[PDB]
From a paper:
The cryo-EM structure of cA4-bound Cat1 shows that the complex assembles into filamentous structures, forming intricate higher-order networks. The fundamental repeat unit of this topology is defined by the two-fold symmetric alignment of a pair of TIR-CARF monomers, involving central positioning of the CARF domains and outwards positioning of the TIR domains. While analyzing the higher-order filament network of cA4-Cat1 complex, we noticed that the dimeric repeat units associate with two adjacent Cat1 dimers forming a surprising trigonal assembly. In this trigonal assembly, the third Cat1 dimer does not pair up with the first Cat1 dimer, but instead it tilts around the center of the dimer (see blue arrow implying a shift below the plane). The tilt causes a shift of the TIR domain, one of which points towards the trigonal assembly, below the plane of repeat units 1 and 2 by 24 Å, thereby forming the helical bundle by bringing it close to the CARF domain β1β2-loop of the Cat1 dimeric unit which initiates the next turn. Thus, the trigonal Cat1 dimer assembly gives rise to a spiral filament bundle with a triangular pore in the middle. To test the importance of these supra-structures for Cat1 activity, we made deletions of residues N103-A104 and N158 to eliminate the backbone interactions that facilitate high-order assembly.
Here we investigated a protein containing a CARF domain fused Toll/interleukin-1 receptor (TIR) domain, Cat1. We found that Cat1 provides immunity by cleaving and depleting NAD+ molecules from the infected host, inducing a growth arrest that prevents viral propagation. Cat1 forms dimers that stack upon each other to generate long filaments that are maintained by bound cOA ligands, with stacked TIR domains forming the NAD+ cleavage catalytic sites.
Author numbering:
A (entry chain H), B (entry chain G), C (entry chain F), D (entry chain E), E (entry chain Q), F (entry chain B), ...: 2 to 33, 42 to 258
Write the structure that this text describes.
RNA sequence: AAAA
RNA sequence: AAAA
RNA sequence: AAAA
RNA sequence: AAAA
RNA sequence: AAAA
RNA sequence: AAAA
């Protein structure tokens, strides 16, 4: 899923660290316009993250972007998830005009907001991620660089809410995993270059095949079988990883 | 699994379509010595196909490989199954010498043979394949090309004997699939060039992932889900189809 | 893709160091008219680099060049990328006339701008290059001169956004790699004279063949194979470089 | 791979059309001594084609050439493939002395020979080529002069036994292609003069680059991409052809 | 009826054997322009025979000649019957351009074609003959030589489609018979020189008189009467025969 | 390419050194009328150099020469390259008459000019040469007297913009190398008398053969091969310079 | 390369026509002592042509000449290639003494000979030429006079063995061209007087320059470029043509 | 080809 | 096919 | 997660 | 990046 | 720049 | 300037 970030340069320190966590969760992100990038792809285009702040409300350039984003959001094209860097009590709603104050209160009440505090990074990163996948189909977890039996792996774990998906789910799923694979060790991507990957979590066989297939000539692939709770090697690109090796995970 | 064919030139006509049927079942066939390539690969080398015939045993060139193949069959390196072109009743065991007759009788009784007759090709071909797959892992029925919902498609049907597989089975398997995909339409191969291929049959997630993965950049891949019983598209290498469409049965 | 540079002589110090970085990215640069050079080649003509600055906006000759460039930009022949030498806040908008101020603000709001700061060289150059390639097909990284296994090399890294290209992409691609090869050691060009050139980045076979073909009798060519992740020599022009060694990277 | 032809003048008519077909398979042929030409090049020197016939073994001069060829074949530097112009049944074994008969019988059994019959040209020529390529790296089908979408070109299709090649394969290879390109229309060579050349078959990126590179300033180059199963033009050395046009295969 | 044969020299062997069979059916044939020879005779001009083949469509001379044949075929001057040397599926339609392929497909569907197979000569030749006579008046089976009661004789078998013919049909007929009578024994013609001819088949009185009359001073004439089913001699040019003898069937 | 120099006698000091530098670049220079000499040779006559200066505009003889030169420049016979001795801001257009000032301003604006500064001579000379070659085919660099391995050479280096020339380029190229060879050591010519020359830069073989050919019995000719990046001797007129010696340059 | 002809007067008719063919192939031939002419020039001296015949070996003067030729052939100064006017089968070995017979058999076996026949001149001349060039550098096909586009012209076709030549190859070459240019129309020489000469065949730049240069003031020179495949005129010594005209193939 |  |  |  |  |  |  794509994600457009609206923010001021003052909170630039914290947006990417939030964005990086989202990036590690196989979520497409776009920073730099955004209004015309909304009308692109499928109706499941992106979820707007309005990083509300005292400074952000003081910028007219940043304000009108929220107006156009919300105006077309009523059409159902996009959904907005506003993030409060400061708690609900201390927004400067007095400084803003009556039209702006009414506009902010309408979207703050009828639409759910996510509170953010820099002190507790762990829960805050979970809350934004939870709201991101709350209205979406099968979710993903941030990839974990773990070592099992002396072998380095990056496990890709996904969770299916309700344990049921539409049979034609892949038709409307805009998740192309090739864009998340690093082409070089120094390149920043969710999936490390040449590092073997592992698939985790319950799911139908067609979902596993769909994720496994684009990894040919890119990464060694492991899969998880709950019959023996062990990892199974199905692709051999790295040296020494024969197809069929078992890792007691 | 590899297969080496022992036969005479007179019975050649019977060999090829037997080999052709075996090739369609994803069985590697080597028709044209034979002894030295038996010592190659893994302990699961091949099955010696001795096309026993009334004339086959009348050639001194044809007798020895049966001896050497049997000689190393005692070592367990290979297993031999005899193809009886004619019935056991009218085999001319009188023609052979005493040593040859007893040797032929020793291998015919202690080792199971399979009867073959030109008249009923469908049963005879099935018995030969059964004699091939009886002591093997997950089976492989011949590739059948079917048009479902107006979409042409070929099915790779696999069935597991028993109910479970060793967790490390893929390590010792010798069914690398790259050698069964045609590169040009005119060239013959078990898998047609550019024709979408569907995987059908119950099995573990890793076995499906192992099969579909080498098909990237080669063929459109379909997969069967038993929850609703249609075919699911995972790879789109052909125009007019996308990953996620369904072919109702 | 070629690039046209419209700037004032005071910003000459920053323009060339910007220009050379673009040149190292396999981008054709034309510094020194420009209005008539716009109408040349393919519809993907060039990106107008308007280095807006406080000194830039007080030159009437510089203003009329921008006016015609934007006038044709409405026709879609050439798009403009305005790069700000100074940040928008300190731009001297009061000095200019009403029509010019409205004109400058019109292109500053509807069309995306990129900011430049002398302090942050690395991020400033990357932002300008990113603005160049965002609307472009397969992009190019700046050429890096590295030594692998004691052998001098230069790597031409290219990344394809979306991992998909039109079948007839080479038809409309205005990149002639011959013009970027130095004919003498002292000549300044993206590709060093007689230095081996390595090709890096995933891509189709035709893209690889098209890129390394013009290098015959000019440079020895290396290519990257991700199956074992190390460069392969395919052309031999220098002494001691047989075609076929592997350089572990 | 080099090829030396040992034959008698009576069987000459058969040799040329065998040599011509082998030449079309990008095989270096040397008809007219031979023993000293064996000591040349790499350990993969050549294959000795002994065109055995009833007339051939009556010549003392032809016999010593076979003697020295087999004597140094024991070192493994060259391997011999004996082509039987006549079937083994009516080979005049009584004519030769005891030493010659024992020698000829020794090399016919332990070494694989091929049968040649004047009636079945298509099967005989393929079998001889099959023995040539059976112990070899990537194959080379004879150049096919085809016409697609109104344009005429010669295709060069190659098959890779197995699926993978050694990383340093090109170092030991001896298939310098520039010797197979005709310089004049009347010149008879595997590659026609100025005729477009197409490469077909799945393989690594470096293999394709190594093949198209010597074709600069010689012929236009086409490559086959399996994503859309179409030929792609990379080089345009002739009018009416542009680099990047696509032919529907 | 006249007929022109359009073919290339590669298929010349099959055209002549088709040619002579049509000649025995009393069909005027012209092998070797053809376009201006179309405008000759009566509105029932002739039938065009386009010997389509994979090699036939690769000649521009054949194509342009075919186009003019179809161009004035629309005017109704001539009707074309395309005889396929190879089966329709094996037609190399990819080689032709868009215009040529569309033109060939237009005439293959809207206009009935005839399929030829060299394996089944007798049925293939009849289909060409059947396509020839399907839109024609009274038919003409090939001349057969039958020795009846020890007397050699040739039969000109004719049958009338339907049951009746126009009263003035003879006015527009193009089957003058003096051009099919051999003048010397060595010279080849549908009617043998000096051999008695016989007319067989139901028909009107004038049809028998019209055919019999040109045979005066040329050959002995026999007429078949269905009242008692023998042959009646009406003209005696050979010794030993008189007008009035009967040949019992 | 030819050229006439229009200047006042006060600028004679700087004109000759500019003329000498252009002469070193294989440019035919004519200093001392100029109007009637314009109509001579081919359509690519020359580029007119107007050495504009404050004193130059004060001469009626110089002014009327410029008028006729520009008047016939409109027909396209020759194009004018205006070289400004002083900067544009310092030109004295006030004392100049109205009609001439409009004439001067029309030329300066619609046609590109080159600035001249005696301080930065290296950039000044190159800028004039750049505009001199800017609208021309393959350009020529100033001759460099280089000693390589103790051997004196005068390298003639040429650059081809776009690496492609019309096949009949030599037909309309007005460059005769004979006139640039010094007949005596004291003669002032671009090519030194009896000093060996070298050809540098990529180009077609016929271009090389065209250049070295008129040097027979005049100078020893060296050529540069990029296969080993070494100079090759092809002519031996000087003592001790055999044809074939290699100079590692 | 130089050539010496050792022959008997009875075979003079066949010898001078062999010399004529060799002369046409740019081979300098001296027919009429020879032993002292062996020691002249470079180590690549000349190839001895011993026209062996039944009459030739019956002359003591011819026999002693061959012995000295073979005496210094062991020293490597000159290599001998023998022409068999008659076949080896019916050579009269019984005439020679034991020493002569053994000596002749010594050179017939360890040294490759060329069989010549009166009937098939075309192959016989080619075989003699092939032996001359087999151990040589860049070949030289016989000069052919071909008219292109109404212009008379002669072609000097040369081909390089393998693909590359030593960088200093020109130093040791003994193929000065001025000795093969006719000075008068009646005089016989490989290169006709005043007829334009064309150079054809792939090769390095210096090779073309070395061949082209000595033709100044002698003949018009055409150069073949493979980019577009025509001949390019570089020197104009004949009226009616200029440097730059093209001769379309 | 016996008025073609 | 005995005025088809 | 052994056709979810 | 082993026909993307 | 080894038929640009 | 070695048939300019």
């Amino acid at each position: 899923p794509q994600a457009f970030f609206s923010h001021n340069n003052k909170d630039k320190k914290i947006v990417l660290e939030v964005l990086e966590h989202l990036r590690q969760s196989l979520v497409a992100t776009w920073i730099d316009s955004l209004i015309q990038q909304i009308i692109a792809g499928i109706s499941k285009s992106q979820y707007f993250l309005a990083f509300l702040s005292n400074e952000y409300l003081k910028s007219d350039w940043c304000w009108d972007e929220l107006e156009q984003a919300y105006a077309l959001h009523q059409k159902g094209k996009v959904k907005i998830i506003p993030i409060l860097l400061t708690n609900r009590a201390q927004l400067d709603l007095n400084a803003l005009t009556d039209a702006r104050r009414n506009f902010l209160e309408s979207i703050l009440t009828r639409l759910k907001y996510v509170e953010f505090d820099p002190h507790n990074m762990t829960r805050s990163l979970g809350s934004v991620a939870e709201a991101l996948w709350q209205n979406e189909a099968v979710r993903f977890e941030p990839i974990r660089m773990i070592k099992v039996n002396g072998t380095e792996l990056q496990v890709v774990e996904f969770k299916i809410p309700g344990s049921n998906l539409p049979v034609d789910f892949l038709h409307h799923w805009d998740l192309k995993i090739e864009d998340f694979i690093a082409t070089s060790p120094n390149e920043q991507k969710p999936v490390k270059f040449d590092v073997p990957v592992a698939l985790y979590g319950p799911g139908p066989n067609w979902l596993y095949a769909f994720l496994t297939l684009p990894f040919k000539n890119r990464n060694t692939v492991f899969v998880f079988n709950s019959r023996t709770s062990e990892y199974i090697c199905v692709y051999s690109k790295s040296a020494g990883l024969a197809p069929g090796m078992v890792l007691k995970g």
